[PDB]
Design a protein around this nucleic acid. Structure first.
Ligand SMILES: [Mg+2]
Ligand SMILES: [Mg+2]
Ligand SMILES: [Mg+2]
Ligand SMILES: [Mg+2]
Ligand SMILES: [Mg+2]
Ligand SMILES: [Mg+2]
Ligand SMILES: [Mg+2]
Ligand SMILES: [Mg+2]
Ligand SMILES: [Zn+2]
Lengths: 94, 134, 38, 176, 136
RNA sequence: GAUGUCGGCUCAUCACAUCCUGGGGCUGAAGUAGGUCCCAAGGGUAUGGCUGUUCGCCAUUUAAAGUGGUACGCGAGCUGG
RNA sequence: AGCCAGGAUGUUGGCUUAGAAGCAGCCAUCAUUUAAAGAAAGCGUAAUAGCUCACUGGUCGAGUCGGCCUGCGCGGAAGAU
């Protein structure tokens, strides 16, 4: 059910990541397996609404980048200190 | 119009039955002589509280009521007081039989489809005094 | 009425209204509830 | 909104005249006029009147619901009457009409003698009853309010001038 | 009124109160009271919010306090000139950063909990926000 | 290489967080009189006993004897307790 | 959201009191026929009567409700030439 439609990050770090969260997108990362890590930027409110549900952090999830449907599990999530926002997600493959 | 829970046997004692309906405008001594034509029949001291459909200046004719349930419980318990809060102390748990001999009381005058249902309401006062079933 | 910085509905029959740039509470049931922000 | 979008139906015997914003209605009870806000197109398109906003005015629909209620009261007002009653309470309170004047006696040292406007008429079937009649709805509540203002009902006994609509909440005095 | 039983030193430097908080998630209960603003929370303030919590909820659930006023604050008394040594400890504060969960609560429904914290929050000098437990 | 400091007297002027008067809402406002808040600074707003007093207590008044600013207003205006 | 209708059976639930009846407080806080009814929301009654929500519905014919994220504004906001 959870199908996150993601794009690939062209620039990384603090300036680039803040530039994203000012534009209602947030950074994330996919790791696991032996494939290299994949840095993705997600649309905030889309992911925000979906992680409200309980079966986002327990079921297999799928992320589409460049057309390729990559299956993952949610692994770690950086929340805003004092808002109902999201800074960063770690997705592990599975 | 003044009401109080009136005695069946005594009429015109001044505190409790003088104001009762001898001061409404009902004939107390032909309510509680006609009602006492009906409580010459009734058991020794059931306050069976009727609805009054009466007049002001010595005329009357009454509709009638079913006899109580709350007055008839404490007999076989051996007590004539009550708790401050039941289901902590009880007054001696009594039989279905007396709760079913009080269920003999409100049977002739209800409208049910299946008559077993009303054994619950008789014990909305049971737990509310302590009369729980085995 | 009672005049305070915080004006609130104190019962269901209360009602907020703004009349000249002034938040007021009218109640049909209790004149005690009449309030003006100020 | 719903108020504006319901059309104003005119019954037989009411001649209507749209000079732009200025609009008057004629009836048996008499001519009534209104000068609507600039944001209100009002149209003849039937035996009805229609209300909707004029592009270029943010208020718009708000004025059209206002305009609708007004003409409706006017159209009703010229055909049938508006009648507000006022009941007097007070042992020594009374009202009488002398022609375009109501002479109220309300426990005052002076006499209250209130003057009516052009198109309002007051009778009294009782010493303690005033009955206004008029084509306008605003003027007849303004007059009934003014008459109510001399002796507005006080809570304890309910003594004063009350609308017969009015239900008065009575309280009991401070104990002892 | 909370206070350290013993401290290594009597008086602490003023310091500064920069940064985001640690203790940002609800960890012991289902619901919590989170700080949005920054500033000192005195021990009297913490006890008053706690007093108002435990009364909005009557012997119901469990309450945790995630902050501790461990920082001693000093004041020179009235009519003392500047200097002549540092003042005497008058009260204890917890330094608060934006994000700090201050109290936590379970054993009650949410709606009672939103009301309990609203009353407690009125006692505090910092903007707050209601928050819920999060999974992973 | 001096800006005279307490209180009094004389003369005052502003502010309003209004003491009285005026207008008002709620009142646990019957009435009389109050309580509380809102608006209002137009005008008005004690004499004496004791003390250097400000103040305060007391006596007796008044519709009321308001609160503060003006170098704790005012000594090239007085006094000098 | 406007606009028509009902609120009952045990029962004045028990305790207390001069009396407490849903409506002083206190415990039971469940039934009941049923389309429905919290052993009763404040008013109100010396107290009941009464008042009426909750309660469930009909007729009515296009959007409505109330939380979150924020943006710009509103009040909160009294001083002395
Ligand atoms: Mg930088
Ligand atoms: Mg003022
Ligand atoms: Mg003038
Ligand atoms: Mg003196
Ligand atoms: Mg002055
Ligand atoms: Mg001076
Ligand atoms: Mg000088
Ligand atoms: Mg000297
Ligand atoms: Zn109200």
């Amino acid at each position: 059910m959870f199908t996150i439609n993601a794009e690939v990050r062209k620039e990384q770090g603090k300036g680039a990541s803040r530039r994203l969260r000012a534009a209602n997108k947030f950074p994330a990362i996919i790791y696991g397996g032996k494939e290299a890590p994949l840095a993705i930027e997600l649309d905030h409110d889309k992911v925000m609404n979906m992680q409200a549900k309980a079966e986002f952090y327990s079921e297999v999830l799928t992320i589409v980048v460049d057309g390729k449907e990559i299956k993952v599990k949610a692994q770690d999530v950086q929340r805003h200190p004092y808002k109902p926002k999201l800074q960063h997600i770690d997705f592990v493959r599975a | 119009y003044v009401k109080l829970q009136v005695a069946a046997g005594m009429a015109n004692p001044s505190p409790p039955v003088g104001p009762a309906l001898g001061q409404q405008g009902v004939n107390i001594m032909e309510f509680c002589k006609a009602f006492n034509a009906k409580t010459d029949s009734i058991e020794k001291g059931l306050p069976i509280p009727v609805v009054i459909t009466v007049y002001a200046d010595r005329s009357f004719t009454f509709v009638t009521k079913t006899p109580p349930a709350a007055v008839l419980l404490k007999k076989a318990a051996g007590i004539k007081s009550g708790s401050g809060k039941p289901n902590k102390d009880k007054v001696g748990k009594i039989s279905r039989a007396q709760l079913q001999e009080i269920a003999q009381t409100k049977a002739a005058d209800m409208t049910g489809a299946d008559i077993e249902a009303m054994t619950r309401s008789i014990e909305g006062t049971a737990r509310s005094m302590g009369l729980v079933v085995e | 009425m009672k005049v305070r910085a915080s004006v609130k509905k104190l019962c269901r029959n209360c009602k907020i209204v703004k009349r000249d740039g002034v938040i007021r509470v009218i109640c049909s049931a209790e004149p005690k509830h009449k309030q003006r922000q100020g | 909104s719903r108020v504006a979008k319901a059309p104003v139906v005119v019954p037989a015997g009411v001649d209507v005249k749209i000079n732009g914003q200025v609009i008057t209605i004629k009836g048996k009870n008499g001519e009534l006029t209104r000068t609507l806000n600039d944001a209100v197109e009002v149209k003849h398109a039937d035996n009805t009147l229609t209300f909707g906003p004029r592009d270029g005015y943010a208020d718009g629909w708000a004025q059209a619901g206002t305009a609708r209620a007004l003409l409706n009261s006017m159209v009703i007002g010229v055909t049938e009457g508006f009648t507000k009653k006022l009941q007097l309470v007070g042992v020594g309170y009374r009202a009488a009409v002398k022609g375009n004047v109501i002479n109220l006696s309300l426990g005052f040292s002076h006499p209250v003698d209130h003057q009516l406007p052009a198109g309002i008429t007051a009778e009294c079937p009782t010493q303690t009853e005033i009955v206004l009649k008029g084509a306008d709805k605003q003027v007849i509540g303004q007059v009934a309010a003014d008459l109510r203002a001399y002796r507005r009902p006080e809570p304890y006994k309910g003594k004063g001038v009350r609308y017969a609509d009015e239900v008065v909440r009575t309280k009991e005095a401070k104990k002892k | 009124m909370l206070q350290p039983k013993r401290t290594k030193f009597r008086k602490m430097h003023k310091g500064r109160n920069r940064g985001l908080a640690q203790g940002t998630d609800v960890s012991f209960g289902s619901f919590g009271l989170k700080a949005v603003g920054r500033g000192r929370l005195t021990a009297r303030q913490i006890e008053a919010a706690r007093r108002a919590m435990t009364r909005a909820v009557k012997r119901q659930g469990k309450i945790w306090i995630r902050v501790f006023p461990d920082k001693p604050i000093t004041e020179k008394p009235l009519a003392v000139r500047m200097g002549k040594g540092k003042g005497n400890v008058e009260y204890w504060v917890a330094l608060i950063q934006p994000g700090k969960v201050l109290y936590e609560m379970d054993g009650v429904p949410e709606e009672l909990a939103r009301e309990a914290f609203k009353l407690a929050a009125a006692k505090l000098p910092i903007k707050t926000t209601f928050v819920t437990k999060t999974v992973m």
